[PDB]
Design an enzyme around this catalytic site. Sequence first.
Site, PDB file in Angstrom:
ATOM      1  N   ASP A  18      35.900  43.525  30.658  1.00 47.66           N
ATOM      2  CA  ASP A  18      37.351  43.628  30.754  1.00 47.66           C
ATOM      3  C   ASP A  18      38.089  42.403  30.190  1.00 47.66           C
ATOM      4  O   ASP A  18      38.237  41.368  30.864  1.00 47.66           O
ATOM      5  CB  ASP A  18      37.749  43.851  32.217  1.00 47.66           C
ATOM      6  CG  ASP A  18      39.203  44.254  32.372  1.00 47.66           C
ATOM      7  OD1 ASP A  18      39.590  44.567  33.506  1.00 47.66           O
ATOM      8  OD2 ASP A  18      39.949  44.282  31.355  1.00 47.66           O
ATOM      9  N   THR A  19      38.606  42.557  28.975  1.00 49.08           N
ATOM     10  CA  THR A  19      39.337  41.486  28.293  1.00 49.08           C
ATOM     11  C   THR A  19      40.696  41.211  28.941  1.00 49.08           C
ATOM     12  O   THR A  19      41.297  40.157  28.703  1.00 49.08           O
ATOM     13  CB  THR A  19      39.559  41.810  26.796  1.00 49.08           C
ATOM     14  OG1 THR A  19      40.325  43.020  26.663  1.00 49.08           O
ATOM     15  CG2 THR A  19      38.227  41.972  26.061  1.00 49.08           C
ATOM     16  N   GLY A  20      41.182  42.152  29.755  1.00 51.91           N
ATOM     17  CA  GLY A  20      42.438  41.969  30.478  1.00 51.91           C
ATOM     18  C   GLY A  20      42.308  41.262  31.818  1.00 51.91           C
ATOM     19  O   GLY A  20      43.300  41.082  32.514  1.00 51.91           O
TER      20      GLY A  20
HETATM   21  C1  LIG Z   1      41.301  55.135  40.993  1.00 50.70           C
HETATM   22  C2  LIG Z   1      41.969  54.042  40.206  1.00 50.70           C
HETATM   23  O1  LIG Z   1      42.418  53.044  40.752  1.00 50.70           O
HETATM   24  C3  LIG Z   1      42.098  54.162  38.712  1.00 50.70           C
HETATM   25  C4  LIG Z   1      41.859  55.382  38.086  1.00 50.70           C
HETATM   26  C5  LIG Z   1      41.977  55.478  36.706  1.00 50.70           C
HETATM   27  C6  LIG Z   1      42.353  54.371  35.953  1.00 50.70           C
HETATM   28  C7  LIG Z   1      42.600  53.133  36.563  1.00 50.70           C
HETATM   29  N1  LIG Z   1      42.969  52.001  35.804  1.00 50.70           N
HETATM   30  C8  LIG Z   1      43.804  50.932  36.339  1.00 50.70           C
HETATM   31  C9  LIG Z   1      44.092  50.087  35.072  1.00 50.70           C
HETATM   32  C10 LIG Z   1      43.871  48.648  35.433  1.00 50.70           C
HETATM   33  O2  LIG Z   1      44.634  48.156  36.254  1.00 50.70           O
HETATM   34  N2  LIG Z   1      42.850  47.991  34.850  1.00 50.70           N
HETATM   35  C11 LIG Z   1      42.470  46.623  35.232  1.00 50.70           C
HETATM   36  C12 LIG Z   1      40.988  46.793  35.620  1.00 50.70           C
HETATM   37  C13 LIG Z   1      40.848  47.906  36.656  1.00 50.70           C
HETATM   38  C14 LIG Z   1      40.294  49.134  36.300  1.00 50.70           C
HETATM   39  C15 LIG Z   1      40.182  50.168  37.231  1.00 50.70           C
HETATM   40  C16 LIG Z   1      40.627  49.999  38.537  1.00 50.70           C
HETATM   41  C17 LIG Z   1      41.171  48.781  38.904  1.00 50.70           C
HETATM   42  C18 LIG Z   1      41.290  47.738  37.969  1.00 50.70           C
HETATM   43  C19 LIG Z   1      42.721  45.580  34.141  1.00 50.70           C
HETATM   44  O3  LIG Z   1      41.808  45.718  33.022  1.00 50.70           O
HETATM   45  C20 LIG Z   1      42.605  44.166  34.738  1.00 50.70           C
HETATM   46  N3  LIG Z   1      43.684  43.898  35.726  1.00 50.70           N
HETATM   47  C21 LIG Z   1      44.711  42.953  35.216  1.00 50.70           C
HETATM   48  C22 LIG Z   1      45.634  43.644  34.196  1.00 50.70           C
HETATM   49  C23 LIG Z   1      46.379  44.829  34.820  1.00 50.70           C
HETATM   50  C24 LIG Z   1      46.632  42.642  33.631  1.00 50.70           C
HETATM   51  S1  LIG Z   1      43.165  43.572  37.238  1.00 50.70           S
HETATM   52  O4  LIG Z   1      44.285  43.820  38.093  1.00 50.70           O
HETATM   53  O5  LIG Z   1      42.059  44.455  37.538  1.00 50.70           O
HETATM   54  C25 LIG Z   1      42.724  42.014  37.368  1.00 50.70           C
HETATM   55  C26 LIG Z   1      41.412  41.650  37.060  1.00 50.70           C
HETATM   56  C27 LIG Z   1      40.998  40.310  37.122  1.00 50.70           C
HETATM   57  C28 LIG Z   1      41.915  39.343  37.492  1.00 50.70           C
HETATM   58  C29 LIG Z   1      43.214  39.676  37.803  1.00 50.70           C
HETATM   59  C30 LIG Z   1      43.638  41.005  37.749  1.00 50.70           C
HETATM   60  O6  LIG Z   1      43.900  38.534  38.138  1.00 50.70           O
HETATM   61  C31 LIG Z   1      43.014  37.416  37.963  1.00 50.70           C
HETATM   62  O7  LIG Z   1      41.740  37.997  37.609  1.00 50.70           O
HETATM   63  O8  LIG Z   1      43.211  50.563  34.047  1.00 50.70           O
HETATM   64  C32 LIG Z   1      42.632  51.794  34.529  1.00 50.70           C
HETATM   65  O9  LIG Z   1      41.966  52.492  33.781  1.00 50.70           O
HETATM   66  C33 LIG Z   1      42.474  53.046  37.957  1.00 50.70           C
END
Ligand SMILES: CC(=O)c1cccc(N2C[C@@H](C(=O)N[C@@H](Cc3ccccc3)[C@H](O)CN(CC(C)C)S(=O)(=O)c3ccc4c(c3)OCO4)OC2=O)c1
Lengths: 99, 99
Positions: A25-27
Amino acid sequence: PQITLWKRPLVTIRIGGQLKEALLDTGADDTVLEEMNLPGKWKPKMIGGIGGFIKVRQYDQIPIEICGHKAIGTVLVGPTPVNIIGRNLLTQIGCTLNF
Amino acid sequence: PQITLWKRPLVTIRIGGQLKEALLDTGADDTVLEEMNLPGKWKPKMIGGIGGFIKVRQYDQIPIEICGHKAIGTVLVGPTPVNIIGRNLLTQIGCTLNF
Ligand SMILES: CC(=O)c1cccc(N2C[C@@H](C(=O)N[C@@H](Cc3ccccc3)[C@H](O)CN(CC(C)C)S(=O)(=O)c3ccc4c(c3)OCO4)OC2=O)c1
Protein backbone atom coordinates in the site's frame (compact mmCIF):
# COMPACT_ATOMS: atom_id res chain seq x y z
CA PRO A 1 8.31 -9.22 -9.78
CA GLN A 2 5.82 -6.79 -11.33
CA ILE A 3 2.36 -6.48 -9.80
CA THR A 4 -0.43 -4.89 -11.87
CA LEU A 5 -3.29 -3.19 -10.14
CA TRP A 6 -6.19 -4.86 -11.94
CA LYS A 7 -6.81 -6.54 -8.56
CA ARG A 8 -5.75 -5.62 -5.03
CA PRO A 9 -1.96 -5.99 -4.57
CA LEU A 10 -2.15 -8.73 -1.96
CA VAL A 11 0.95 -10.70 -1.10
CA THR A 12 1.90 -13.24 1.53
CA ILE A 13 3.72 -11.94 4.60
CA ARG A 14 5.26 -13.76 7.56
CA ILE A 15 5.43 -12.35 11.07
CA GLY A 16 6.75 -15.00 13.44
CA GLY A 17 4.64 -18.14 13.11
CA GLN A 18 1.79 -16.32 11.37
CA LEU A 19 1.31 -16.12 7.63
CA LYS A 20 -1.13 -13.50 6.45
CA GLU A 21 -2.15 -11.79 3.26
CA ALA A 22 -1.36 -8.06 3.10
CA LEU A 23 -1.78 -5.08 0.76
CA LEU A 24 1.31 -3.48 -0.71
CA ASP A 25 0.00 0.00 0.00
CA THR A 26 1.73 3.13 -1.35
CA GLY A 27 -0.97 5.26 0.32
CA ALA A 28 0.01 4.02 3.80
CA ASP A 29 2.86 5.84 5.62
CA ASP A 30 3.00 3.07 8.20
CA THR A 31 2.42 -0.67 8.32
CA VAL A 32 -0.87 -1.63 9.98
CA LEU A 33 -1.64 -5.23 10.85
CA GLU A 34 -4.77 -6.98 12.09
CA GLU A 35 -5.16 -7.67 15.79
CA MET A 36 -2.37 -9.95 17.02
CA ASN A 37 -0.54 -10.45 20.33
CA LEU A 38 3.10 -9.67 19.50
CA PRO A 39 5.79 -9.87 22.20
CA GLY A 40 7.60 -6.82 23.54
CA LYS A 41 7.10 -3.15 24.33
CA TRP A 42 4.67 -0.96 22.45
CA LYS A 43 3.06 2.46 22.67
CA PRO A 44 -0.49 3.58 21.84
CA LYS A 45 -1.18 5.68 18.75
CA MET A 46 -4.09 6.93 16.65
CA ILE A 47 -4.05 6.71 12.86
CA GLY A 48 -6.54 8.33 10.53
CA GLY A 49 -8.09 7.37 7.22
CA ILE A 50 -11.45 7.23 5.48
CA GLY A 51 -14.18 7.20 8.18
CA GLY A 52 -11.88 8.58 10.91
CA PHE A 53 -9.36 7.12 13.32
CA ILE A 54 -8.48 3.83 14.94
CA LYS A 55 -6.33 3.19 17.99
CA VAL A 56 -3.27 1.03 17.34
CA ARG A 57 -0.30 -0.38 19.26
CA GLN A 58 3.09 0.59 17.86
CA TYR A 59 5.76 -2.15 18.05
CA ASP A 60 9.31 -1.35 16.93
CA GLN A 61 11.99 -3.42 15.19
CA ILE A 62 9.66 -6.27 14.21
CA PRO A 63 10.99 -8.55 11.46
CA ILE A 64 8.53 -9.37 8.67
CA GLU A 65 9.13 -11.43 5.50
CA ILE A 66 7.26 -10.09 2.46
CA CYS A 67 7.32 -12.46 -0.56
CA GLY A 68 10.60 -13.86 0.76
CA HIS A 69 12.11 -10.37 1.10
CA LYS A 70 13.42 -9.45 4.56
CA ALA A 71 12.15 -6.37 6.34
CA ILE A 72 12.38 -5.03 9.87
CA GLY A 73 10.70 -1.97 11.31
CA THR A 74 7.74 -0.39 13.02
CA VAL A 75 4.42 -2.23 12.88
CA LEU A 76 1.10 -0.82 14.09
CA VAL A 77 -1.36 -3.41 15.37
CA GLY A 78 -5.04 -2.65 15.57
CA PRO A 79 -8.59 -3.22 14.40
CA THR A 80 -8.04 -2.98 10.65
CA PRO A 81 -10.06 -5.17 8.22
CA VAL A 82 -6.94 -5.74 6.13
CA ASN A 83 -3.21 -6.12 6.70
CA ILE A 84 -1.42 -3.09 5.24
CA ILE A 85 2.24 -2.99 4.25
CA GLY A 86 3.14 0.68 4.34
CA ARG A 87 6.00 2.69 2.86
CA ASN A 88 8.24 2.15 5.90
CA LEU A 89 8.63 -1.50 4.82
CA LEU A 90 7.95 -1.20 1.08
CA THR A 91 11.25 0.69 0.66
CA GLN A 92 13.14 -2.08 2.47
CA ILE A 93 11.99 -4.71 -0.05
CA GLY A 94 12.81 -2.50 -3.04
CA CYS A 95 9.24 -1.64 -4.02
CA THR A 96 8.64 1.22 -6.48
CA LEU A 97 5.71 2.61 -8.45
CA ASN A 98 6.17 2.78 -12.22
CA PHE A 99 4.17 4.17 -15.13
CA PRO B 1 8.31 7.88 -14.29
CA GLN B 2 9.64 5.61 -11.54
CA ILE B 3 8.63 6.66 -8.02
CA THR B 4 10.34 5.51 -4.82
CA LEU B 5 8.53 5.41 -1.49
CA TRP B 6 10.79 7.18 1.02
CA LYS B 7 8.35 10.06 0.53
CA ARG B 8 4.57 10.08 -0.02
CA PRO B 9 3.85 9.52 -3.74
CA LEU B 10 2.02 12.81 -4.18
CA VAL B 11 1.44 13.99 -7.71
CA THR B 12 -0.26 16.89 -9.41
CA ILE B 13 -3.55 16.09 -11.13
CA ARG B 14 -5.65 18.21 -13.49
CA ILE B 15 -9.42 17.95 -13.21
CA GLY B 16 -11.93 20.50 -14.57
CA GLY B 17 -9.04 22.88 -15.29
CA GLN B 18 -8.08 22.78 -11.61
CA LEU B 19 -4.71 21.54 -10.34
CA LYS B 20 -4.75 19.50 -7.11
CA GLU B 21 -2.27 17.28 -5.27
CA ALA B 22 -3.22 13.63 -4.85
CA LEU B 23 -1.75 10.51 -3.36
CA LEU B 24 -1.07 7.48 -5.56
CA ASP B 25 -2.72 4.88 -3.36
CA THR B 26 -2.34 1.21 -4.35
CA GLY B 27 -4.33 0.15 -1.25
CA ALA B 28 -7.41 2.06 -2.51
CA ASP B 29 -9.86 0.35 -4.89
CA ASP B 30 -11.42 3.71 -5.74
CA THR B 31 -10.31 7.27 -6.42
CA VAL B 32 -11.70 9.61 -3.75
CA LEU B 33 -11.28 13.40 -3.81
CA GLU B 34 -12.02 16.00 -1.14
CA GLU B 35 -15.14 18.16 -1.46
CA MET B 36 -15.27 19.93 -4.82
CA ASN B 37 -17.82 20.85 -7.47
CA LEU B 38 -17.99 18.64 -10.55
CA PRO B 39 -20.59 19.02 -13.31
CA GLY B 40 -23.11 16.38 -14.35
CA LYS B 41 -25.23 13.79 -12.61
CA TRP B 42 -23.94 12.01 -9.54
CA LYS B 43 -25.19 9.14 -7.39
CA PRO B 44 -25.06 8.90 -3.60
CA LYS B 45 -22.76 6.09 -2.51
CA MET B 46 -21.26 4.87 0.74
CA ILE B 47 -17.72 3.54 1.08
CA GLY B 48 -15.64 1.98 3.84
CA GLY B 49 -12.23 2.91 5.20
CA ILE B 50 -9.98 2.17 8.15
CA GLY B 51 -12.05 4.43 10.43
CA GLY B 52 -15.55 3.50 9.33
CA PHE B 53 -17.94 4.32 6.50
CA ILE B 54 -18.64 7.65 4.79
CA LYS B 55 -21.07 9.10 2.29
CA VAL B 56 -19.68 10.17 -1.07
CA ARG B 57 -20.96 11.48 -4.41
CA GLN B 58 -20.13 9.24 -7.38
CA TYR B 59 -19.27 10.93 -10.69
CA ASP B 60 -18.65 8.73 -13.72
CA GLN B 61 -16.48 9.30 -16.80
CA ILE B 62 -14.54 12.26 -15.40
CA PRO B 63 -11.28 13.14 -17.21
CA ILE B 64 -8.26 13.44 -14.90
CA GLU B 65 -4.70 13.96 -16.08
CA ILE B 66 -2.41 12.38 -13.52
CA CYS B 67 1.21 13.43 -13.77
CA GLY B 68 0.72 13.93 -17.54
CA HIS B 69 -1.20 10.68 -18.14
CA LYS B 70 -4.85 10.80 -19.22
CA ALA B 71 -7.57 8.87 -17.42
CA ILE B 72 -11.36 8.97 -17.78
CA GLY B 73 -13.31 7.27 -15.03
CA THR B 74 -15.16 7.24 -11.76
CA VAL B 75 -14.42 9.85 -9.15
CA LEU B 76 -15.91 9.71 -5.65
CA VAL B 77 -16.17 13.06 -3.83
CA GLY B 78 -16.44 13.20 -0.05
CA PRO B 79 -14.68 13.50 3.35
CA THR B 80 -11.51 11.58 2.53
CA PRO B 81 -8.58 12.81 4.65
CA VAL B 82 -6.55 13.45 1.46
CA ASN B 83 -7.11 13.24 -2.29
CA ILE B 84 -6.37 9.64 -3.31
CA ILE B 85 -5.87 8.09 -6.73
CA GLY B 86 -7.10 4.50 -6.50
CA ARG B 87 -6.68 1.41 -8.63
CA ASN B 88 -9.60 2.31 -10.92
CA LEU B 89 -7.47 5.13 -12.38
CA LEU B 90 -3.98 3.74 -11.60
CA THR B 91 -4.65 0.89 -14.05
CA GLN B 92 -5.70 3.41 -16.71
CA ILE B 93 -2.36 5.26 -16.51
CA GLY B 94 -0.45 1.95 -16.57
CA CYS B 95 0.80 2.03 -12.98
CA THR B 96 2.44 -1.11 -11.53
CA LEU B 97 4.35 -2.02 -8.39
CA ASN B 98 7.85 -3.41 -8.90
CA PHE B 99 10.44 -5.01 -6.62
C1 LIG C 1 -14.98 -3.35 4.14
C2 LIG C 1 -14.12 -2.15 3.89
O1 LIG C 1 -13.76 -1.42 4.80
C3 LIG C 1 -13.69 -1.82 2.49
C4 LIG C 1 -14.29 -2.45 1.40
C5 LIG C 1 -13.88 -2.13 0.11
C6 LIG C 1 -12.89 -1.19 -0.10
C7 LIG C 1 -12.26 -0.54 0.98
N1 LIG C 1 -11.24 0.41 0.77
C8 LIG C 1 -11.00 1.52 1.69
C9 LIG C 1 -9.97 2.37 0.91
C10 LIG C 1 -8.87 2.73 1.86
O2 LIG C 1 -9.16 3.47 2.79
N2 LIG C 1 -7.64 2.22 1.65
C11 LIG C 1 -6.53 2.41 2.60
C12 LIG C 1 -6.13 0.96 2.91
C13 LIG C 1 -7.35 0.17 3.37
C14 LIG C 1 -7.92 -0.79 2.54
C15 LIG C 1 -9.05 -1.51 2.93
C16 LIG C 1 -9.64 -1.28 4.17
C17 LIG C 1 -9.08 -0.33 5.01
C18 LIG C 1 -7.94 0.39 4.62
C19 LIG C 1 -5.40 3.28 2.06
O3 LIG C 1 -4.64 2.62 1.01
C20 LIG C 1 -4.46 3.69 3.21
N3 LIG C 1 -5.14 4.58 4.18
C21 LIG C 1 -4.68 5.99 4.10
C22 LIG C 1 -5.25 6.68 2.86
C23 LIG C 1 -6.79 6.72 2.89
C24 LIG C 1 -4.71 8.10 2.75
S1 LIG C 1 -5.24 3.99 5.70
O4 LIG C 1 -6.30 4.72 6.33
O5 LIG C 1 -5.53 2.58 5.62
C25 LIG C 1 -3.85 4.25 6.51
C26 LIG C 1 -2.83 3.31 6.42
C27 LIG C 1 -1.60 3.51 7.07
C28 LIG C 1 -1.41 4.68 7.79
C29 LIG C 1 -2.40 5.62 7.89
C30 LIG C 1 -3.63 5.43 7.26
O6 LIG C 1 -1.95 6.66 8.67
C31 LIG C 1 -0.59 6.40 9.02
O7 LIG C 1 -0.31 5.09 8.49
O8 LIG C 1 -9.53 1.57 -0.20
C32 LIG C 1 -10.42 0.44 -0.28
O9 LIG C 1 -10.36 -0.32 -1.23
C33 LIG C 1 -12.69 -0.86 2.28
